[PDB]
Write an enzyme that holds these catalytic residues in place. Structure first.
Site, PDB file in Angstrom:
ATOM      1  N   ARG A 171      -1.830  11.778 -12.952  1.00  0.00           N
ATOM      2  CA  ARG A 171      -2.196  13.138 -12.518  1.00  0.00           C
ATOM      3  C   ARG A 171      -3.655  13.229 -12.126  1.00  0.00           C
ATOM      4  NH1 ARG A 171       1.986  16.795 -13.818  1.00  0.00           N
ATOM      5  NH2 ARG A 171       3.059  16.348 -15.786  1.00  0.00           N
ATOM      6  N   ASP A 194      11.369  20.800  -3.111  1.00  0.00           N
ATOM      7  CA  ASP A 194      12.339  19.904  -2.482  1.00  0.00           C
ATOM      8  C   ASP A 194      13.699  20.583  -2.300  1.00  0.00           C
ATOM      9  OD1 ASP A 194      13.128  19.483  -5.249  1.00  0.00           O
ATOM     10  OD2 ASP A 194      11.993  17.616  -5.310  1.00  0.00           O
ATOM     11  N   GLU A 239       3.016  25.938  -6.166  1.00  0.00           N
ATOM     12  CA  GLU A 239       3.685  24.723  -6.576  1.00  0.00           C
ATOM     13  C   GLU A 239       3.055  23.504  -5.978  1.00  0.00           C
ATOM     14  OE1 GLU A 239       7.382  24.634  -9.004  1.00  0.00           O
ATOM     15  OE2 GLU A 239       5.712  23.310  -8.510  1.00  0.00           O
TER      16      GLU A 239
HETATM   17 MG   LIG Z   1       5.805  21.664  -9.812  1.00  0.00          MG
END
Ligand SMILES: [Mg+2]
Ligand SMILES: [Mg+2]
Lengths: 169, 170
Positions: B161, B99, B95
């Protein structure tokens, strides 16, 4: 399945990718670009390529699978994952790891044209124009090569993690 | 707009190399299956796997939110499930950020249904102060404060990104 020889080194790949990015930046000076990478094999190339592009870049992915013989001869593929982003009136660059017969990419081309982009170009790391079964010229080509693995490209799902491109058997 | 650089390109490269070493140590002499959670982890995954010398198989998973339900329970809709066989395999799920951990906990249960030999989590960024469920990632790049970030595969409304570094936005 064993690796035979290194065909394109890690350093050659990095230099070539930087060069392709410069070519792309020149062709789209001052404008946004949508990069659409064909999964799974182009993901490494795409990750490196976009990091050298200074323009505002939007990236998305497309996945397509074969219908069998039909695919090998006509390029007809089943869309497994279609794009989420808007490419209508946008500059689009479709990124591939390899283009050989061009049948499947030609079919994908027609699909993208249905979305009415402003421009649609193809960028491939590797090209084998002697294998073409349809008219398709990529605007950006990394290397013209004569089975290979590495840098995102597999052999039965293996070797995608090599930082270089190699021959196998 | 972008505010400040939070983690530089060079810091990212060094940390990624280090996470790869930690992974190689934990799976000495074995093949590994890396499953990257699209879309945000693709840059991290591309860099991470290139430092892993073990035989690696990579695949992708895509999950989307159901709305409030996702924010409170982690329930997500699988948009694209895995194609590769992870039964009896060593699996590392990659990932960009963890969070609340709600969504990854849900993805954990999904992968366990496939009966892998081992299943670990690797995240570039961790915000343990935001946890709503018990989930400790075995591999963590950086602990960041609860703020909006972009770059290195991570977007803000599909933008940014492509930055080679991680930055704050305001
Ligand atoms: Mg992600
Ligand atoms: Mg391909």
């Amino acid at each position: 399945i064993e690796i035979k020889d290194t065909l394109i080194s890690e350093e050659q790949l990095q230099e070539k990718v930087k060069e392709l990015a410069l070519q792309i930046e020149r062709d789209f000076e001052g404008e946004e670009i949508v990069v659409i990478a064909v999964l799974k094999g182009s993901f490494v190339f795409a990750a490196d390529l976009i990091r050298h592009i200074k323009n505002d870049v939007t990236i998305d992915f497309i996945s397509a699978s074969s219908y069998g013989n039909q695919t090998e001869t006509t390029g007809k593929v089943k869309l497994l994952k279609d794009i989420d982003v808007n490419i209508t009136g946008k500059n689009v660059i479709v990124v591939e790891d390899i283009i050989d017969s061009g049948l499947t990419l030609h079919f994908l081309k027609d699909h993208f044209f249905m979305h009415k982009p402003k421009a649609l170009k193809f960028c491939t790391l590797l090209d084998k124009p002697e294998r073409r079964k349809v008219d398709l010229t990529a605007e950006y080509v990394g290397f013209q090569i004569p089975f290979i693995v590495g840098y995102g490209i597999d052999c039965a799902e293996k070797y995608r993690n090599l930082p270089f491109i190699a021959s196998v058997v």
